[PDB]
Write an enzyme that holds these catalytic residues in place. Structure first.
Site, PDB file in Angstrom:
ATOM      1  N   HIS A 162      22.915  53.616  44.769  1.00 12.74           N
ATOM      2  CA  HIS A 162      24.237  53.614  44.792  1.00 12.74           C
ATOM      3  C   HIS A 162      25.388  53.347  43.346  1.00 12.74           C
ATOM      4  CE1 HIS A 162      28.090  52.629  45.694  1.00 12.74           C
ATOM      5  NE2 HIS A 162      28.347  51.447  45.171  1.00 12.74           N
ATOM      6  N   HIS A 213      27.808  52.413  41.478  1.00 12.40           N
ATOM      7  CA  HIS A 213      29.141  51.297  42.467  1.00 12.40           C
ATOM      8  C   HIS A 213      30.373  51.235  41.203  1.00 12.40           C
ATOM      9  CE1 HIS A 213      29.122  46.652  42.903  1.00 12.40           C
ATOM     10  NE2 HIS A 213      30.280  46.813  42.432  1.00 12.40           N
ATOM     11  N   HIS A 253      23.211  50.932  41.040  1.00 10.53           N
ATOM     12  CA  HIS A 253      21.453  50.390  41.650  1.00 10.53           C
ATOM     13  C   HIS A 253      21.098  50.504  42.405  1.00 10.53           C
ATOM     14  CE1 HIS A 253      23.942  47.964  44.388  1.00 10.53           C
ATOM     15  NE2 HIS A 253      24.818  48.210  43.565  1.00 10.53           N
ATOM     16  N   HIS A 273      20.206  50.997  46.846  1.00 11.16           N
ATOM     17  CA  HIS A 273      20.686  50.816  47.621  1.00 11.16           C
ATOM     18  C   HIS A 273      19.615  50.543  48.842  1.00 11.16           C
ATOM     19  CE1 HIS A 273      24.514  48.391  49.695  1.00 11.16           C
ATOM     20  NE2 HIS A 273      24.906  48.925  48.936  1.00 11.16           N
ATOM     21  N   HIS A 277      30.122  33.108  47.565  1.00  7.17           N
ATOM     22  CA  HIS A 277      29.620  35.159  47.989  1.00  7.17           C
ATOM     23  C   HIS A 277      30.597  35.756  47.319  1.00  7.17           C
ATOM     24  CE1 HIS A 277      26.547  32.775  50.918  1.00  7.17           C
ATOM     25  NE2 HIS A 277      27.682  32.254  51.533  1.00  7.17           N
ATOM     26  N   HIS A 313      31.589  42.359  47.692  1.00  4.74           N
ATOM     27  CA  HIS A 313      31.777  44.160  47.596  1.00  4.74           C
ATOM     28  C   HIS A 313      32.315  45.190  48.419  1.00  4.74           C
ATOM     29  CE1 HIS A 313      32.304  47.501  45.333  1.00  4.74           C
ATOM     30  NE2 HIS A 313      30.477  48.050  46.017  1.00  4.74           N
ATOM     31  N   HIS A 346      32.720  49.296  48.818  1.00  6.85           N
ATOM     32  CA  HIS A 346      32.900  50.538  48.253  1.00  6.85           C
ATOM     33  C   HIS A 346      33.866  51.630  48.779  1.00  6.85           C
ATOM     34  CE1 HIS A 346      28.377  50.430  48.624  1.00  6.85           C
ATOM     35  NE2 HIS A 346      28.830  49.148  48.593  1.00  6.85           N
ATOM     36  N   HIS A 391      30.279  44.504  51.905  1.00  7.06           N
ATOM     37  CA  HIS A 391      29.196  42.778  51.770  1.00  7.06           C
ATOM     38  C   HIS A 391      29.046  42.438  51.141  1.00  7.06           C
ATOM     39  CE1 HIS A 391      26.692  44.579  48.611  1.00  7.06           C
ATOM     40  NE2 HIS A 391      26.729  46.075  49.598  1.00  7.06           N
ATOM     41  N   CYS A 392      27.830  41.042  51.373  1.00  8.96           N
ATOM     42  CA  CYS A 392      28.304  40.386  50.165  1.00  8.96           C
ATOM     43  C   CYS A 392      27.024  41.076  48.801  1.00  8.96           C
ATOM     44  CB  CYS A 392      27.298  38.757  50.499  1.00  8.96           C
ATOM     45  SG  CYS A 392      26.673  37.960  49.090  1.00  8.96           S
ATOM     46  N   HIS A 393      27.142  40.705  47.641  1.00  7.77           N
ATOM     47  CA  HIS A 393      26.335  41.591  46.881  1.00  7.77           C
ATOM     48  C   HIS A 393      25.750  41.225  46.823  1.00  7.77           C
ATOM     49  CE1 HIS A 393      25.336  44.703  43.628  1.00  7.77           C
ATOM     50  NE2 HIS A 393      26.761  45.587  44.716  1.00  7.77           N
ATOM     51  N   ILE A 394      25.115  39.375  46.465  1.00  8.86           N
ATOM     52  CA  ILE A 394      23.529  38.714  46.355  1.00  8.86           C
ATOM     53  C   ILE A 394      22.669  39.692  47.608  1.00  8.86           C
ATOM     54  CG2 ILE A 394      22.776  36.391  46.931  1.00  8.86           C
ATOM     55  CD1 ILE A 394      25.195  35.341  46.562  1.00  8.86           C
ATOM     56  N   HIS A 397      20.949  38.521  50.496  1.00 10.55           N
ATOM     57  CA  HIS A 397      21.797  37.843  51.355  1.00 10.55           C
ATOM     58  C   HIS A 397      22.834  39.030  52.108  1.00 10.55           C
ATOM     59  CE1 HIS A 397      23.608  33.531  49.591  1.00 10.55           C
ATOM     60  NE2 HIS A 397      22.158  34.151  50.211  1.00 10.55           N
ATOM     61  N   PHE A 418      23.796  40.418  55.630  1.00  9.72           N
ATOM     62  CA  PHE A 418      25.527  39.488  55.453  1.00  9.72           C
ATOM     63  C   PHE A 418      26.476  40.812  55.161  1.00  9.72           C
ATOM     64  CE2 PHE A 418      27.533  35.878  53.167  1.00  9.72           C
ATOM     65  CZ  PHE A 418      27.987  36.065  54.759  1.00  9.72           C
TER      66      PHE A 418
HETATM   67 CU   LIG Z   1      25.554  35.210  49.647  1.00  6.51          CU
HETATM   68 CU   LIG Z   2      26.740  47.457  43.330  1.00  7.63          CU
HETATM   69 CU   LIG Z   3      29.994  49.468  45.372  1.00  9.30          CU
HETATM   70 CU   LIG Z   4      26.758  47.750  48.784  1.00  9.11          CU
END
Ligand SMILES: [Cu+2]
Ligand SMILES: [Cu+2]
Ligand SMILES: [Cu+2]
Ligand SMILES: [Cu+2]
Ligand SMILES: *[C@@H]1O[C@H](CO)[C@@H](O[C@@H]2O[C@H](CO)[C@@H](O[C@@H]3O[C@H](CO[C@H]4O[C@H](CO)[C@@H](O)[C@H](O[C@H]5O[C@H](CO)[C@@H](O)[C@H](O)[C@@H]5O)[C@@H]4O)[C@@H](O)[C@H](O)[C@@H]3O)[C@H](O)[C@H]2NC(C)=O)[C@H](O)[C@H]1NC(C)=O
Ligand SMILES: *[C@@H]1O[C@H](CO)[C@@H](O[C@@H]2O[C@H](CO)[C@@H](O[C@@H]3O[C@H](CO)[C@@H](O)[C@H](O)[C@@H]3O)[C@H](O)[C@H]2NC(C)=O)[C@H](O)[C@H]1NC(C)=O
Ligand SMILES: *[C@@H]1O[C@H](CO)[C@@H](O)[C@H](O)[C@H]1NC(C)=O
Ligand SMILES: *[C@@H]1O[C@H](CO)[C@@H](O)[C@H](O)[C@H]1NC(C)=O
Length: 499
Positions: A64, A66, A109, A111, A395, A398, A400, A452-455, A458, A463
């Site tokens: 991905h 980002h 990163h 994905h 949290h 993010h 896209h 989504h949460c980017h942790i 999670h 998530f």
């Molecule tokens: Cu989270």
């Molecule tokens: Cu990202």
């Molecule tokens: Cu992204």
């Molecule tokens: Cu993502």
């Protein structure tokens, strides 16, 4: 560094960023991966060569990019089973996209699952030859990119489902763990009398970091790829996946100064030079700093950030004054996260491929209950009320394919419909403060987009939801290359041990 046209070769390799050797996923031999760079208007042709051999860290991969809108190239966005099937081992896949209307600091990163925690992550910069902030600094290059990362001695699939912090924070790929307090620290070199545009990139998979440099203040000029008015701070809390550009004036005495990146949990503080790097002025001896940390008196507050140019907030200045309002109710059961009653499970057929195969309504799209169909050319408001039902706060969420206005930030009750900052990753805050972080964006970009949460641990627990935007136009807007069409058959043909 590399790009806009380049091979990105993905392999498993032994690395020791903190002196502790372990197998990791690397890009062109290194983790974090090399800087990918270009200029606004560039066509990026990034050939990702999957030479992975380790099933535990996944032999398949998907990358991905980002922060990029990916208009007309939804297929190259990266999220596995949303925008593509993963690349298979022994195969390569060309991500071919343009960045016509964006400049700034980004990253790339994996994905796919939690693979980016295992090392597949690096910075990505798009330069602006007419950068409106150019007069505020003298230097902006490879050596002014500062990456932050959480590093674990146990691989993502081998440790706890939700680890209690990293073994070490890495700054520019190096940091210290308790196991070795003499491990090599990263050095960032500055020549006295020059101003530097430092591009701070969080490659973190979990924890946020409170970033500061001893004896120096920072002027924030960019927020996740959005030019901001100059904001002077003495510390920056940066959440996972966020970016900041700050100007540092190298105006202090020729000396060594501690660069600090204190995580919110895990090994906190700076005993033995953990969570630390070195700011070395040209001419200073090759030693550790002995500088002391001072109390932050000007910490960054998101509500203090405003766009450099006038940027209208989508919709009208009222709660729900938009074409479509969506609330995200969070739940957590010990192992899985839920949004509005649904824990995300990746579909067999990628959401984009489903759309290309005719699925245009939420009813027809899979997984059921996790896909939200959005009207075209519409203002959208999404609220993420913080709740104790979903632990792991704060949290960072993010979206896209989009930049959004942060109409309400964490730790704030104010709704800013006039001049709030725009970004792509936002902290949703804490239930203690009764946070109700709310975002706004326009639906100008046909395709399915991950929210989504980017942790990453999670995300792995589900998530996540999909925003399916302008579904009847997706096919015509996003023509797909043969190589993309070939990804799913190849992946589905894999022995599950080669995944
Ligand atoms: Cu989270
Ligand atoms: Cu990202
Ligand atoms: Cu992204
Ligand atoms: Cu993502
Ligand atoms: C595929 O990837 C996965 C995930 O990365 C690998 O999983 C590893 O599995 C092994 C079990 O086979 C685990 O081994 C444990 O490692 C503990 C820590 O080992 C470090 O410290 C040792 C003492 O100081 C040191 O000897 C060791 O160095 C050796 O291993 C390194 C790679 O781990 C290598 O780079 C060095 O050259 C050297 O050979 C380590 O620094 C140890 O205490 C335990 O007793 C046990 O041996 C790992 O923890 C798992 N790794 C992770 C990150 O979770 C798997 O091996 C990969 N498969 C292949 C084929 O490589
Ligand atoms: C980074 O920004 C901070 C905040 O603006 C600056 O801190 C300020 O520093 C000045 C000069 O050192 C302080 O004023 C001085 O205070 C001392 C002791 O009280 C006094 O003896 C001097 O005569 C002078 O008045 C000021 O108090 C301080 N402000 C705050 C709120 O902490 C800092 O200087 C900046 N750093 C750099 C290197 O630019
Ligand atoms: C949480 O819910 C998921 C279904 O979404 C289920 O698979 C899992 O077993 C649950 N875990 C618990 C009870 O901790
Ligand atoms: C958050 O905002 C939304 C939309 O304005 C609202 O419906 C919801 O009740 C709010 N949640 C909390 C806990 O304040």
């Amino acid at each position: 560094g590399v790009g806009p046209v380049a091979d990105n070769t993905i392999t498993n390799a032994a690395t020791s960023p903190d002196g502790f050797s372990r197998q990791a996923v690397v890009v062109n031999g290194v983790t974090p991966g090399p800087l990918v760079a270009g200029n606004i208007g560039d066509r990026f042709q990034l050939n990702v060569i999957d030479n992975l051999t380790n099933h535990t860290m996944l032999k398949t991969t998907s990358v991905h990019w980002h922060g990029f809108f990916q208009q007309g190239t939804n297929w190259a966005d990266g999220p596995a089973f949303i925008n593509q099937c993963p690349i298979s081992p022994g195969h390569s896949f060309l991500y071919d996209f343009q960045v016509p209307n964006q400049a700034g600091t980004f990253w790339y990163h994996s994905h796919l699952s939690t693979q980016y925690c295992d090392g597949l992550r690096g910075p990505f910069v798009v330069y602006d030859p007419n950068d409106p902030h150019a007069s505020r600094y003298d230097v902006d290059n490879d050596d002014t990119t500062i990456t932050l990362a959480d590093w674990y001695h146990t691989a993502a699939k081998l440790g706890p489902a939700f680890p209690n912090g990293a073994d070490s924070t890495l700054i520019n790929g190096k940091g210290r763990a308790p196991s070795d307090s003499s491990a090599q620290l990263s050095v960032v070199s500055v020549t006295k009398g020059k101003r530097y545009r430092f591009r701070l990139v969080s490659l973190s998979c979990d924890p946020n970091f409170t970033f500061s440099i001893d004896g120096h203040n920072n002027t924030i000029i960019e927020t996740d790829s959005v030019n901001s008015q100059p904001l002077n701070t003495d510390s920056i809390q940066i959440f996972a996946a966020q970016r900041y550009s700050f100007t540092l004036n190298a105006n202090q005495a020729v000396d060594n100064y501690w660069i600090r990146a204190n995580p919110n949990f895990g090994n906190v503080g700076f005993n033995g030079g953990i969570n630390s790097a070195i700011l070395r002025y040209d001419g200073a001896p090759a030693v550790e700093p002995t500088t002391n940390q001072s109390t932050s008196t000007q910490p960054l507050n998101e509500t203090n950030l405003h766009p450099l140019v006038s940027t209208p907030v989508p919709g009208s200045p009222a709660a729900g004054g938009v074409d479509k309002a969506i609330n995200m109710a969070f739940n957590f059961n010990g192992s899985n996260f839920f949004i509005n009653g649904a824990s995300f499970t990746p579909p067999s057929v990628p959401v984009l491929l489903q759309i290309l195969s005719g699925a245009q309504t939420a009813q027809d799209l899979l997984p059921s209950g996790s896909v939200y169909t959005l009207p075209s050319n519409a203002s959208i408001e999404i609220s993420f009320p913080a709740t104790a039902a979903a632990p792991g706060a704060p949290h960072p969420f993010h979206l896209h394919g989009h930049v959004f206005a942060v109409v309400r930030s964490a730790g704030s009750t104010v709704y800013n419909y006039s001049n709030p900052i725009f970004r792509d990753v936002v902290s949703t805050g804490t239930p203690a403060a009764g946070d109700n972080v709310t975002i706004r964006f326009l639906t100008n970009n046909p395709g399915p987009w991950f929210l989504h949460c980017h942790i990453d641990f999670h995300l792995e627990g589900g998530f996540a939801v999909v925003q399916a935007e302008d579904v009847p136009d997706v096919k015509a807007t996003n023509p797909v290359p043969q190589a993309w069409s070939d990804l799913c058959p190849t992946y589905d043909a894999n022995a599950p041990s080669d995944q």
